[PDB]
Amino acid sequence: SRKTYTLTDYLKNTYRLKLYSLRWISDHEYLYKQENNILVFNAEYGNSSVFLENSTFDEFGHSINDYSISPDGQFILLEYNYVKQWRHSYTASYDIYDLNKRQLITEERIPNNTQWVTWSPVGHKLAYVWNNDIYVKIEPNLPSYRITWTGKEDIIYNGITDWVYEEEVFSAYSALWWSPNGTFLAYAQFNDTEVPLIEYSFYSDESLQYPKTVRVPYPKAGAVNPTVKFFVVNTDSLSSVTNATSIQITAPASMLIGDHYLCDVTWATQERISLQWLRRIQNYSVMDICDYDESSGRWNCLVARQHIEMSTTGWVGRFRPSEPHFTLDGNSFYKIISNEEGYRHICYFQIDKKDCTFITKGTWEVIGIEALTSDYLYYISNEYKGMPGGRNLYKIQLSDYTKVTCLSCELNPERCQYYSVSFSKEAKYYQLRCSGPGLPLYTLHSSVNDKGLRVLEDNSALDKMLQNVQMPSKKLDFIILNETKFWYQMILPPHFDKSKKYPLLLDVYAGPCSQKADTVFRLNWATYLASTENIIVASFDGRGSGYQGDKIMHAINRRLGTFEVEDQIEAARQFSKMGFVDNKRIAIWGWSYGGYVTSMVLGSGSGVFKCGIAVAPVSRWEYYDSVYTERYMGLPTPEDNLDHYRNSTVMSRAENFKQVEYLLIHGTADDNVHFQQSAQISKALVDVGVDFQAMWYTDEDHGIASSTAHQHIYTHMSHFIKQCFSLP
Ligand SMILES: COc1ccc(-c2cc(N3C[C@H](c4cc(F)c(F)cc4F)[C@@H](N)C3)ncn2)cn1
Ligand SMILES: *[C@@H]1O[C@H](CO)[C@@H](O[C@@H]2O[C@H](CO)[C@@H](O)[C@H](O)[C@H]2NC(C)=O)[C@H](O)[C@H]1NC(C)=O
Ligand SMILES: *[C@@H]1O[C@H](CO)[C@@H](O[C@@H]2O[C@H](CO)[C@@H](O)[C@H](O)[C@H]2NC(C)=O)[C@H](O)[C@H]1NC(C)=O
Ligand SMILES: *[C@@H]1O[C@H](CO)[C@@H](O)[C@H](O)[C@H]1NC(C)=O
């Protein structure tokens, strides 16, 4: 048809997917921001009113980064002065604005460089972390209560996580959990005293004459890890004159005999907390249930309430143990667990009883449980049509497990196969969000008889624009390795002609529990490559991949760098035997784990690939952090798994790169996958006389996400691909 989807279109966000981000504030109302107004919507009728005009803060004098309205409507938190730290951490300033009095609170303000602020879940108490210590404000205009006195930069963290807990365990900076009531505040304390530091140079603005050395406690594989403690404070009995009493909850005997992690914290009732702990050998976990004792003011954890979840074939959970969903009474809960055959299904547990009752089964997986009411459990799975890369909402009747209703499967089957959901409080209403394979579609629904109420956002604007672009298509299908089905996706150029040979770029992640073949709709680099440059972009899910059971997922156990790499080479050979692929023009590329896979494939000597790009790769597992590495790899000791640590490096394959054109890219301020990793790759290739191309990105981290760098890397990569494929 007409213009194609260009690199610039991608780089400059020319064709924008619209979203419908709402925030539930009750069982029947949400907040939504429709151009410099906050609107409140009524879910049942769809009427709205303006909550707050942005004009309110025209003369506030600071650019407001975000906001948080107190659950009771009384106050809004204003976040400005935002400074990114790692993936989820950042610091900021905070002003509180009283919505009834229509004025800023000017007394007893939150300090600058506050690390974390949370409202209680009810009312308007605040808890915040400043200088690695926790402070609680009962009223926003009143002086705070200091909870901890031990916070120490780089060493003791109260209520916030250190580097590896942020990245690998909680996926959050916060380590503060209010009870449902707001009576108790639970928090974790991390101790990094002997964790070694990664050090790297930060060059900063050109005006900085001497570069800065950034130092971060970061346990690489096998190193000393942070230790953790857990504490609960009663915030309804705090004194101005007497220091706050925090009650410690210790980890079970079965954990305390060695290194372990706190891997999950979930309140069950107003006086019951559940804690999951994990051994540093991540094949064994324990859930504790801890009940408050009114008489002593302490927390007791009966050994008979401990639930064990262990694996005999791999590790526990997909990334970590799944979280429990408690019945309103707190005497039982639902959790996703791997069943006798390897499939992740919902299990029913009652608190002072042994076993558990599986309420789903089949050759598919539950992705997550989304809501629990007295009659139904709402969950997301990939059962529909046996497509591991599709996602649908279901409900199961708690009085009869055979009564499962798919709630999303047939709302719009050609356009919609990949749903997520957001339930109101008490799950009276839900927003469904489909992400593919058509354009995203956002809808509101009522849980009573599962009636559609309202289309929220249908992306009709974007639909119309794309009718005007020569858009590529997605093929989603499967091949067979060894009597098992493995799924792959292909991005095909517009006006695809199977009697012509196309160049193929293999897009790789292939990390454990990854999935790269799915029904999601994306506008990305592959879109450009297929639409303008007529390259087929393919992605393949082999051994190690997720959402198809443990047999596939755990094939890679103690063995990273093997089956997941072979499987990509094999997928490529099978793509090249289908007759529309030019087998003298196959390339490969990947980021993070995919850059480790790309390098191991280029270094395999297979002869399949002409060229490849590795961005921020791992090169050797001893360099990456302990929590993630040791999950898949055990420990790099001779009593454990040192030999496969040494056989799984990129560097050992250096000679083989003389058969391929390789482009290696890394940001110098990468705090996650250290520049060290690529420095050691380059050094091995030079020692062996292999020529290659490189690019460093000064001061960029693992996402290489600053917008000029993002643009420059995708541009640099597109030239490399064009040249390797003799494309004009
Ligand atoms: C419910 O809590 C969950 C659930 C899922 C995940 C999760 C983690 C994850 N990771 C990939 C990342 C990573 C791995 C590399 F090999 C690498 F080179 C760089 C890199 F950033 C790991 N730090 C963690 N990827 C997808 N999902 C994390 N938390
Ligand atoms: C949706 O419409 C209803 C009905 O007009 C609003 O309900 C009224 O709300 C105001 C403030 O809550 C009350 O003083 C009225 O007396 C209510 N009347 C009735 C008949 O319900 C509701 O406020 C609207 N909701 C939104 C979100 O704008
Ligand atoms: C959890 O961690 C380790 C590693 O897989 C297991 O300990 C090994 O047990 C196997 C049994 O197949 C022995 O052959 C090895 O000699 C042990 N290796 C080491 C270094 O300890 C342990 O079995 C796992 N636990 C579970 C529940 O399966
Ligand atoms: C919240 O729970 C605590 C402990 O059960 C109790 O003391 C307090 O009264 C509760 N707050 C409410 C619901 O008013």
mmCIF file of C-alpha atoms in Angstrom, residues 17 384 387 389-392 409 412-419 433-441 462-463 466 471-476 489 518-523:
data_model
loop_
_atom_site.group_PDB
_atom_site.id
_atom_site.type_symbol
_atom_site.label_atom_id
_atom_site.label_comp_id
_atom_site.label_asym_id
_atom_site.label_seq_id
_atom_site.Cartn_x
_atom_site.Cartn_y
_atom_site.Cartn_z
ATOM 1 C CA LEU A 17 -0.714 2.867 21.387
ATOM 2 C CA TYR A 384 -7.487 -21.604 25.558
ATOM 3 C CA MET A 387 -1.690 -21.830 23.046
ATOM 4 C CA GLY A 389 1.350 -17.690 24.481
ATOM 5 C CA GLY A 390 -2.321 -16.705 24.864
ATOM 6 C CA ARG A 391 -3.816 -15.406 28.116
ATOM 7 C CA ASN A 392 -7.427 -15.398 29.308
ATOM 8 C CA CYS A 409 -12.007 -16.159 25.387
ATOM 9 C CA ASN A 412 -13.497 -10.863 20.487
ATOM 10 C CA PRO A 413 -11.588 -13.958 19.348
ATOM 11 C CA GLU A 414 -9.740 -12.745 16.175
ATOM 12 C CA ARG A 415 -8.571 -9.530 17.707
ATOM 13 C CA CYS A 416 -8.087 -10.621 21.360
ATOM 14 C CA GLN A 417 -6.082 -13.543 22.838
ATOM 15 C CA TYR A 418 -3.865 -11.994 25.473
ATOM 16 C CA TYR A 419 -5.671 -10.496 28.461
ATOM 17 C CA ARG A 433 -6.973 -5.283 28.922
ATOM 18 C CA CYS A 434 -6.124 -7.195 25.715
ATOM 19 C CA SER A 435 -2.746 -6.642 24.169
ATOM 20 C CA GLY A 436 -3.027 -8.693 21.042
ATOM 21 C CA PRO A 437 -2.926 -9.901 18.467
ATOM 22 C CA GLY A 438 -5.163 -6.943 17.236
ATOM 23 C CA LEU A 439 -4.721 -3.466 18.655
ATOM 24 C CA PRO A 440 -5.198 -3.216 22.415
ATOM 25 C CA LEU A 441 -8.722 -2.947 23.705
ATOM 26 C CA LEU A 462 -4.273 4.074 15.735
ATOM 27 C CA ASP A 463 -6.256 1.561 13.681
ATOM 28 C CA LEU A 466 -2.052 1.857 10.399
ATOM 29 C CA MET A 471 2.320 -3.247 8.173
ATOM 30 C CA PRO A 472 3.964 -6.613 8.600
ATOM 31 C CA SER A 473 2.054 -9.709 9.839
ATOM 32 C CA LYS A 474 2.692 -12.063 12.697
ATOM 33 C CA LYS A 475 2.668 -15.858 12.246
ATOM 34 C CA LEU A 476 2.468 -17.814 15.514
ATOM 35 C CA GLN A 489 6.687 -16.351 16.037
ATOM 36 C CA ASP A 518 2.983 -14.907 21.990
ATOM 37 C CA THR A 519 -0.180 -13.150 20.855
ATOM 38 C CA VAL A 520 0.909 -9.655 21.903
ATOM 39 C CA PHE A 521 0.765 -6.776 19.468
ATOM 40 C CA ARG A 522 3.968 -4.717 19.332
ATOM 41 C CA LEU A 523 5.377 -1.742 17.432
#
